[PDB]
Amino acid sequence: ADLEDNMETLNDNLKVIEKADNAAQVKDALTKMRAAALDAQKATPPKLEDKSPDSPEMWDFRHGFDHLVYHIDDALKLANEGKVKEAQAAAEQLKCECNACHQKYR
Numbered sequence: 001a002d003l004e005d006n007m008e009t010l011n012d013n014l015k016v017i018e019k020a021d022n023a024a025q026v027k028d029a030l031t032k033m034r035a036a037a038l039d040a041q042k043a044t045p046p047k048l049e050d051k052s053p054d055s056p057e058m059w060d061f062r063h064g065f066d067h068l069v070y071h072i073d074d075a076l077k078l079a080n081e082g083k084v085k086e087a088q089a090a091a092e093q094l095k096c097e098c099n100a101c102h103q104k105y106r
């Protein structure tokens, strides 16, 4: 899918996670965020179209999704451990970290 749709998937499932009351619902939303993040990693954003993949900006662009998946996997582990509240807290701090890549390249 394109970058804007993957970003909508990330933004929407973060809303799903903070409204959830069961671990299965949290794990499902994180699973879709993981797919959207790995798919967003292969795209080129409009303001970086003049750059090559090995440019510092594009290495940094792909690196941001590596760290996002890292936090998704940790939250997925918490959800698999039945820790709904802790998984939701991980998602809130993860949500805060979304802003940095937008400030650079959005």
Ligand code: HEC
Binding pocket: 003, 004, 005, 007, 008, 010, 011, 014, 045, 046, 060, 061, 062, 063, 064, 065, 068, 094, 095, 097, 098, 099, 101, 102, 105, 106
């Ligand atoms: C870079 C490695 C990113 C990180 C991590 C996240 N986002 Fe992102 N996002 C990024 C860019 C370059 C853009 C602009 C795309 C464009 O075509 O202009 C976006 C956009 C969004 C949007 C708006 C989508 C739209 O229809 O305009 C949203 C709602 C969004 N991003 C959400 C979002 C969330 C919740 C993130 C943390 C899970 C997140 N993004 C990370 C680049 C990057």
